[PDB]
Amino acid sequence: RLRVVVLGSTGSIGTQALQVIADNPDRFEVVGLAAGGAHLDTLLRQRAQTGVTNIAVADEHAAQRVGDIPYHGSDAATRLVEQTEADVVLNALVGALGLRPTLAALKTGARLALANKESLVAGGSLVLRAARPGQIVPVDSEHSALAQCLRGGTPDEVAKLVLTASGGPFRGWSAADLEHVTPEQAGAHPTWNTLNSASLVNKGLEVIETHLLFGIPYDRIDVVVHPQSIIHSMVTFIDGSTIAQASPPDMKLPISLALGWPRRVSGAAAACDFHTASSWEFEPLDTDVFPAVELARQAGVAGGCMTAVYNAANEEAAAAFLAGRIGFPAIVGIIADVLHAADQWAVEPATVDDVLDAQRWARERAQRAVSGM
Amino acid sequence: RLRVVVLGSTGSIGTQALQVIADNPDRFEVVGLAAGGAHLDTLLRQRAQTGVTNIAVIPYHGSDAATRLVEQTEADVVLNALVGALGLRPTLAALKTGARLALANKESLVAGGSLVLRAARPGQIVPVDSEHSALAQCLRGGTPDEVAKLVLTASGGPFRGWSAADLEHVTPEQAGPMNTLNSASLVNKGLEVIETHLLFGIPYDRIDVVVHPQSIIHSMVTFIDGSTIAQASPPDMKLPISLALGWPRRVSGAAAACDFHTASSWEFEPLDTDVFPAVELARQAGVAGGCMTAVYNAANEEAAAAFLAGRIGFPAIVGIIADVLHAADQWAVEPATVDDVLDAQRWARERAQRAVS
Ligand SMILES: O=C(c1ccccc1Cn1cncn1)N(O)CC[C@@H](c1ccc(Cl)c(Cl)c1)P(=O)(O)O
Ligand SMILES: [Mn+2]
């Protein structure tokens, strides 16, 4: 029985992970839960339902609303990871909260089932340095597919990695059409991922993660638009053979595989039914209209903290768009402007502080680009 | 540098295999060539162009010439691309020497069955068919206990989606050369499903067939978690040939890969087994076992030849297979020798001609 710590337990990935674990008590036992703090109601139900009292809340003010959370405030999730004996740490925390628990999980020797994108994109080689071969197992559909498809040959036999992309809500839109796009049109409803999916920045992040997880050069990582999202990614080998992973969209599949790696979890998700006719479409990404992916490749080839800069510039430009300060195509315009000025940030991140410094620099630089304009 | 005997060197597989070898001298060395005899013109051209004098139809002549070539030649890989019963004996000989058997000859498995499997150690037979090659690759996607289903793709032939009525008027020219006909009738897939059960040990009820007209995905494995792993490539037999020769190592530049710089779509649909029962009949014959699969194949051969001669309609090809198998309840017994296999086939051929009359 594998002891699992679920970080970011109240989001979509976390709840689905708990469902997989609840369905499979023979293979998994939850030994810890952590939440950012936005969905304290969910976490308290999770404590009541799992009987797990080993729980953390990052938001100090949210935790004080309850008064009996064992780890709270600054680095609560990291401390839970450091102090809990576990076989697997699932990291589905949001944004910046993910990095230090990723590093803590890796130092414990546990398998890291990684859902948090910022960890790898921002942390880069800082994170890779902390890991042994095979210790990081990806939770993202695309990277899970790749990991599975890579079993099709040896590393020297790999020619290309092909990521599929839905294309988002603006697939087939003109550059002129995007000028008028509103946040709500992108599926975003401002508050105290859906936008990054619309801008294709999410796909650029996945390209960076692909390079870091699997060690394949950026010019051998392709993106293909596949609106059905049935094929989740593919690997082309040196002999001409492509191996692909397919399933009806259901995140419980890649979540189960990361938890149970390398053993598959029986009945995790429904398989492709070929009793109905279906048609799977493939088309090139319109790189003229959606340059986010090529910009990610650019940041990634330059290297080091440039990927933290790419991500941080995106967050700030995206927030400006949600605020109504800039238009939609300006998001990737600002990312490009920030990277062009980021010559000091190609260095490898030596410490967590290097990452946070790069991110702070990038945000301020994006703010300057936003303000004028 | 692997030493390769090519049996059936003048046919399609044989010739593509030699091109693969010639392109990879550091990986491969041809140490022997064999052919039926009808294609002597190209066989002697193959001698002059490869410098191989170890040939069988000249040191080796006769019906057993290919077997004797295999027994006396030191070889790591024997590619058996002989068509028909010509391949059965050389299959056993190659297996006996301990060499890897890259199998393209459907008969030795479909007819031979247990006879061939008992002469082989696990992993000695490496399949050359694109569908089986695809499954072998996709099975790397999990461990044996995690396999839920093997899924073979079928082009569906020229009569994809036609009605039973539409089929009655089909001419030899419309159906596309027996290999081509076997694709039109879905008997090819029937034979591959039988071979799949035999090569991989998966029960017939977990071997599915799906129609995929593009022939890009060559087969898939669905695992117990809901994941399916598929193998895709533009159709080119040099890919599964190269892999069967270099197993488990891939051969750089064997075939062109899928290019996604151009838009395409891949269609999947069920086979209407009311209109195309060839695969279902293959499952039945397979489950019965013994000499029943030899009967399936033999009856097809005669029914197919009768269609190509204008004697029966297209739908009658599989109808004759069903008839012959329905009378073959005597043949659900395990074959003890090669002659037991040939007996069932002679019987099937004769009972098939009866139906044609
Ligand atoms: O890989 C392929 C293959 C697939 C597509 C194109 C060429 C090849 C190579 N090829 C071998 N023999 C003849 N061609 N096959 O294994 C052929 C079987 C399938 C098939 C499919 C389309 C056609 Cl036009 C024909 Cl004739 C046969 P099927 O109908 O059993 O699926
Ligand atoms: Mn994704």
- Name B292's Cβ contacts closer than 8 Å, sequence gap at least 6: B285, B286, B325, B328, B331, B332
- Asked whether the beta carbons of residue B229 and residue A263 sit closer than 8 angstroms, the reply is no
Inter-residue contact B83 to B11 (CB < 8 Å): yes
B234 CB less than 6 Å from ligand 1? no
- Asked whether the beta carbons of residue B264 and residue A284 sit closer than 8 angstroms, the reply is no
How far does B307 lie from chain A, in Å, by closest CA?
31
Pick the residue whose CA is nearest to atom 12 on ligand 1. B179
- Residue B281 CA to residue B321 CA, distance in Å, equals 8
Q: Report the DSSP pairing between strands A278-284 and B228-232.
A: unpaired
- Residue A180 CA to residue A189 CA, distance in Å, equals 17
The backbone torsions φ and ψ at residue B315, rounded to the nearest 5 degrees and listed phi first, read: -60, -20
Question: With 0-12 CB in 10 A as exposed, 13-18 as middle and 19+ as buried, what is B222?
Answer: buried
Pick the residue whose CA is nearest to atom 1 on ligand 1. B130
Instruction: Report in angstroms the alpha-carbon separations of A126 from A99, A107, A348.
Output: 10, 12, 8
Q: Pick the closest to residue A72 from A96, A50, A56 (CA basis).
A: A56
Q: Pick the closest to residue A168 from A136, A145, A141, A201 (CA basis).
A: A201
- Asked whether the beta carbons of residue A240 and residue B256 sit closer than 8 angstroms, the reply is yes
Question: Which residues of chain B make contact with A20, given a CB cutoff of 8 A?
Answer: none
In ligand 1, the atom with minimum distance to the C-alpha of B131 is: 16
Breakpoints of chain A, after residues (C–N > 2.5 Å): 192
Q: Is A92 helix (H, G, I), strand (E, B) or coil?
A: coil
B180 CB less than 6 Å from ligand 1? yes
- Asked whether the beta carbons of residue B227 and residue A247 sit closer than 8 angstroms, the reply is yes
* Structure-token match 């300060």, residue found: A325
- Residue B245 CA to residue B10 CA, distance in Å, equals 17
CA of B44 to the centre of ligand 2 (A): 57
| Residue in B27, B138, B215, B227 to test binding to A, most A beta-carbons within 10 Å | B227
**Is A1-140 in CATH node 3.40.50.300?**
no
The string of DSSP letters for A219-272 reads GGEEEEE-TT--EEEEEEETTS-EEEEE-SS-THHHHHHHHHTTS--TTSSPPP
Question: Which residues of chain A make contact with B273, given a CB cutoff of 8 A?
Answer: none
How far does A159 lie from chain B, in Å, by closest CA?
10
Which among A267, A272, A284 is the nearest to B260, CB-wise?
A284
- Asked whether the beta carbons of residue A162 and residue B260 sit closer than 8 angstroms, the reply is yes
- Residue B50 CA to residue B61 CA, distance in Å, equals 20
Q: Give me the amino acid identity at A51.
A: G
Does B189 show up as a binding residue in the annotation?
yes
Q: Which ligand is nearest to the CA of A249?
A: 2
Q: Pick the closest to residue A77 from A13, A116, A33, A38 (CA basis).
A: A33
The answer to whether A153 faces chain B, any CB pair under 8 Å, is yes
The answer to whether B183 faces chain A, any CB pair under 8 Å, is no
Q: Pick the closest to residue B301 from B168, B142, B107, B132 (CA basis).
A: B107
Please state whether B62 falls in left (phi above 0), alpha (psi between -120 and 50) or beta. Answer: left
- Per the DSSP assignment, residues forming a β-bridge with B357 are none
Q: Which ligand is nearest to the CA of A202?
A: 2
Question: With 0-12 CB in 10 A as exposed, 13-18 as middle and 19+ as buried, what is A194?
Answer: middle
Instruction: For the domain covering B1-129, report its CATH number.
Output: 3.40.50.720
Q: Please report, in angstroms and rounded to a whole number, the separation of the first and last CA atoms in chain B.
A: 54
Which among B233, B263, B269 is the nearest to A283, CB-wise?
B263
Inter-residue contact A345 to A304 (CB < 8 Å): yes
Structure tokens at A362: 């990038």
How far does B40 lie from chain A, in Å, by closest CA?
32
* Chain-centroid distance, C-alpha A318: 17
The answer to whether B161 faces chain A, any CB pair under 8 Å, is no
How far does A98 lie from chain B, in Å, by closest CA?
28
Task: Count interface pairs A-B at CB distance under 8 A.
Answer: 159
Question: Which residues of chain B make contact with A167, given a CB cutoff of 8 A?
Answer: none
Q: How many CB atoms lie within 10 A of CB A344?
A: 11
Pick the residue whose CA is nearest to atom 3 on ligand 1. B235
Q: Please report, in angstroms and rounded to a whole number, the separation of the first and last CA atoms in chain A.
A: 57
Packing angle of the helix pair A99-108, A76-83 (nearest 10 deg): 10
Q: Is A137 helix (H, G, I), strand (E, B) or coil?
A: strand
- Asked whether the beta carbons of residue A241 and residue B261 sit closer than 8 angstroms, the reply is no
- Asked whether the beta carbons of residue A247 and residue B228 sit closer than 8 angstroms, the reply is yes
The string of DSSP letters for B73-114 reads S--SEEEE---GGGGHHHHHHHHHHT-EEEE--HHHHHTTTH
Half-sphere exposure of A19 (CA within 13 A, CB side): 15
Residue ranges per domain, chain B? 1-129, 130-272, 273-357
Virtual CA dihedral for B11, B13, B18, B23, nearest 10 degrees? 140
The answer to whether B242 faces chain A, any CB pair under 8 Å, is yes
* Structure-token match 């069955």, residue found: B113
How far does A341 lie from chain B, in Å, by closest CA?
32
Pick the residue whose CA is nearest to atom 18 on ligand 1. B183
**Is A287-373 in CATH node 3.10.450.50?**
no
Which among A239, A275, A282 is the nearest to B243, CB-wise?
A239
Residues in chain A: 373
Fold entry, domain B273-357? Rna Polymerase Sigma Factor; Chain: A (1.10.1740)
Resolution in A: 1.9
- Asked whether the beta carbons of residue A264 and residue B146 sit closer than 8 angstroms, the reply is yes
Q: Name the DSSP class of B29.
A: E
Q: Report the DSSP pairing between strands A28-35 and A55-57.
A: parallel
Report angle CA B136, B142, B147 to the nearest 5 degrees.
Answer: 80
If DSSP states are collapsed to H, E and C, what string results for B160-222?
CCCCHHHHCCCCCCCCCCHHHHHHHHCHHHHHHHHHHHHHHCCCHHHEEEEECCCCCEEEEEE
B183 CB less than 6 Å from ligand 1? yes
Q: Which of B16, B155, B233 to mutate to test the pocket of ligand 1 (most atoms within 8 A of CB)?
A: B155
- Asked whether the beta carbons of residue A238 and residue B252 sit closer than 8 angstroms, the reply is yes
Q: How many helices (H) and strands (E) does chain B have?
A: 15, 11
Q: Pick the closest to residue B147 from B194, B105, B85, B196 (CA basis).
A: B196
In ligand 1, the atom with minimum distance to the C-alpha of B154 is: 31
Inter-residue contact B141 to B229 (CB < 8 Å): yes
The backbone torsions φ and ψ at residue B152, rounded to the nearest 5 degrees and listed phi first, read: -90, 140
Preceding peptide of B237 cis, ω within 30°: no
- Asked whether the beta carbons of residue A153 and residue B233 sit closer than 8 angstroms, the reply is no
Burial B96-122 (b: 16+ CB within 10 A, else e): ebebbbbbbbbbbbbbbbebbeebbee
Question: Which residues of chain B make contact with A172, given a CB cutoff of 8 A?
Answer: none
**Which strand ranges, in their side-by-side order, compose the sheet holding A231-237?**
B207-211, B147-154, B217-223, B228-232, A242-246, A231-237, A158-165, A221-225, A278-284, B264-268
